[PDB]
């Protein structure tokens, strides 16, 4: 995959491999690892992250919705996949034909599905229980039993597992968390039989209490080397390795005279003669306008962004007359300077999770494995 | 093309067509229209909008960088395409064989290109002049004349046009706009001869001053039916037709008891008995966390978002019990209620341009033409 604009993201698969390996070491032998690769693996590349996680010790994969599971299958991934979110009862046959497990939490879903499907492939279901997140999941014992009854009755429906999700596993105070964990145990008792796969921990929960992860953990944010939250960082059992970095190059360089304005709205005025560099990245690439007033790295030095950020372009104040082609790092390291995704999330007034997901389809991803470029992916 | 999540965007190509067709009649008959379709047509679908615009009167297309132009050609587009942004002189040949025009703003670029290219396909260039935007473009007479001469010299280089871009055309006050217009006229005199295509007008400039557009306009934002700025809405010569809308469906419905928490951080807590719906759209789809105090349309009414927006979903307070599958409109109209891209932009404290561009690859685009679904585009579909 080649691309023709000097803007790209770099995904170090070694960082992903290591984050997964360290979790494997930490976790009891009986706890499996399910790599969470939804949203194109949090913007890092679904297949690339998936195959690497499987190498490091993960045996299963998780995605947000059916299409994401189908995209993995089409790309050659044959490992087990679980859709964490909702799906259509009408798509049960497709999921089954494609060996994709589905999350379920309503009895009417199963009834609708039973009327529309009768074989020949079995469908593996993971019952979602709401223990406090208030997102998806069954909440009454009567419903739980009805759902189980419908699955056991259908000759092609299988209850592979059951789970819940924690809403505050990344907060120092563990009051609500403990509440959710306790409620989960009580609800499990509603099941006539304990499914082979019981899981509940995400990155925060698994890393903090690896001994209360039952038989499978759903490793997400930490696999990409990003902390679940600022407050949990000083609690992480091992150093996370950031895998995502973002770069570009100066495509234009010019010296402005005092009084000259830059970008839309002419919001910036050069107070003194200075050199301005233009880079080929804008908000259509996920470098949102809110990043105005932020600093990028060039020649190992911080260079503030000047004026408003454009759809495809960006202007910065250079320390001096630098040549076109000079490497600009928006996320990553240059010399003794470093910009993390947390720094970017901070300025964007959001959390690390959102940043890589927002770097759009337009930005090619270059993959590094064993310190060598292994593959390049340009969505267009 | 199919998709398997109840979340999608609809692009009304009839609206696209009408916005461009109206511009066709507003402008002088000899003025060409270049449809700007960079960023996958501002998130509406590059080839679908490009093809539609050409039917409506547009004769040329514009993109941000080379990859977007090659994409259009791969998709069957044959009309002229100009790359507005920078490019690698090493890629000159490829662009030439693909009949893609390139923007140029410095002589050393031509030096490098000339050293690596010697035919057979001609490369058409559009010289960029910076008239106050401070992005790209030459700024002195010397450099200008040098670019022209280097183009003249090379047997396969051709100066097709010259242009500039306005930084404040969508502002009521026209002081800076006037300065830029006047500077552009001054800079045009630096050229030994006028290239066939002189241009400067974007949506705002073209719509407000159609008789000040030279021989070609670059129609962007208004083609999608979006006002260049809320400020000039009353100055619009003709009503724009909003092309983009975003929808979803409830995938779960439940009645919470007072005291129960919702979403990450246990941020929200129900005070009394209420109904909560869950929809399959989150920030990985472009529905940013920043929208947590915003709302959506359901059952023909405004339904506030509750708690924090997750990566793939969010919760909303329902007016009461509703069936799973009930349609939810994030951007569009339901009965006598409506949420526009401008509404989303205002809440997010950003401009309308950014909103559709942010609705990610993950969201399928359903295309309508002549009031019927024409095609579906699912970026991750089989
Ligand atoms: C059901 C489920 N399990 C595990 C994970 C992994 O969580 P982690 O990246 O903190 O390790 C997620 C993603 N959780 C989400 C984070 O933001 N929105 C989400 O849905 C999830 O939805
Ligand atoms: C050179 C050029 N011409 C024409 C247009 C169309 O502008 P319009 O959508 O206001 O009609 C743009 C896009 N203008 C941009 C808007 O944000 N960043 C941009 O580069 C552009 O960059």
XYZ file of N, CA and C in Angstrom, chain A residues 380, chain B residues 35-41 45-51 54 60-83 98 100 377:
129
model
N -7.517 4.544 1.231
C -7.974 5.047 -0.063
C -6.946 4.803 -1.169
N -16.462 21.470 -8.662
C -17.037 20.926 -7.439
C -15.913 20.424 -6.538
N -15.882 20.916 -5.305
C -14.850 20.507 -4.360
C -15.319 19.260 -3.615
N -14.673 18.130 -3.885
C -15.066 16.883 -3.244
C -13.974 16.204 -2.412
N -13.080 16.998 -1.832
C -12.022 16.449 -0.993
C -12.643 15.867 0.284
N -11.867 15.090 1.035
C -12.359 14.482 2.277
C -13.611 13.648 2.029
N -13.575 12.835 0.974
C -14.708 12.007 0.588
C -15.945 12.887 0.445
N -15.769 14.016 -0.236
C -16.850 14.972 -0.449
C -17.411 15.460 0.889
N -19.531 11.287 0.350
C -19.316 10.271 -0.675
C -18.687 10.911 -1.908
N -17.375 10.756 -2.039
C -16.640 11.367 -3.135
C -17.194 11.174 -4.543
N -17.292 9.931 -4.996
C -17.771 9.686 -6.346
C -19.259 9.977 -6.561
N -20.086 9.725 -5.547
C -21.521 9.976 -5.681
C -21.813 11.470 -5.845
N -21.172 12.305 -5.035
C -21.389 13.740 -5.146
C -20.727 14.303 -6.405
N -19.535 13.811 -6.738
C -18.814 14.300 -7.915
C -19.627 14.062 -9.185
N -20.110 12.835 -9.337
C -20.915 12.439 -10.483
C -22.189 13.290 -10.558
N -21.459 16.990 -11.579
C -21.171 17.104 -13.005
C -22.470 17.149 -13.826
N -15.571 20.453 -13.620
C -14.279 20.058 -13.067
C -14.426 19.701 -11.591
N -13.463 18.950 -11.066
C -13.490 18.545 -9.664
C -12.201 18.953 -8.959
N -12.261 19.064 -7.632
C -11.091 19.419 -6.837
C -11.007 18.544 -5.594
N -9.783 18.172 -5.228
C -9.531 17.340 -4.056
C -8.383 17.951 -3.261
N -8.122 17.409 -2.074
C -7.062 17.925 -1.214
C -5.673 17.419 -1.570
N -5.544 16.119 -1.823
C -4.248 15.555 -2.174
C -4.353 14.451 -3.215
N -3.218 14.092 -3.806
C -3.183 13.093 -4.868
C -3.958 11.788 -4.671
N -3.928 11.209 -3.472
C -4.638 9.943 -3.261
C -6.132 10.047 -3.521
N -6.722 11.186 -3.179
C -8.149 11.378 -3.380
C -8.495 11.474 -4.869
N -7.581 12.032 -5.658
C -7.791 12.167 -7.093
C -7.691 10.796 -7.763
N -6.677 10.018 -7.398
C -6.510 8.686 -7.978
C -7.738 7.834 -7.643
N -8.281 8.031 -6.444
C -9.463 7.306 -6.000
C -10.645 7.590 -6.925
N -10.854 8.860 -7.264
C -11.960 9.219 -8.143
C -11.806 8.545 -9.504
N -10.595 8.560 -10.052
C -10.340 7.926 -11.348
C -10.622 6.425 -11.266
N -10.173 5.795 -10.187
C -10.402 4.370 -10.014
C -11.894 4.092 -9.995
N -12.659 5.039 -9.464
C -14.100 4.886 -9.372
C -14.859 5.277 -10.640
N -14.138 5.475 -11.740
C -14.801 5.793 -12.995
C -14.948 7.244 -13.410
N -14.502 8.174 -12.573
C -14.598 9.599 -12.887
C -13.585 9.983 -13.969
N -14.042 10.691 -15.000
C -13.166 11.097 -16.098
C -13.002 12.599 -16.296
N -13.810 13.392 -15.602
C -13.726 14.846 -15.710
C -12.398 15.337 -15.135
N -12.000 16.571 -15.463
C -10.737 17.090 -14.937
C -10.741 17.145 -13.409
N -9.587 16.890 -12.800
C -9.465 16.929 -11.344
C -8.220 17.715 -10.974
N -8.373 18.652 -10.046
C -7.253 19.459 -9.584
C -6.961 19.151 -8.121
N -5.682 18.959 -7.817
C -5.253 18.706 -6.452
C -4.965 20.086 -5.883
N -2.538 10.005 -15.099
C -3.910 9.938 -14.598
C -4.681 11.217 -14.913
N -4.355 14.294 -13.919
C -4.716 15.042 -12.724
C -3.863 16.304 -12.651
N -23.235 2.704 0.473
C -21.789 2.619 0.563
C -21.398 2.311 2.002
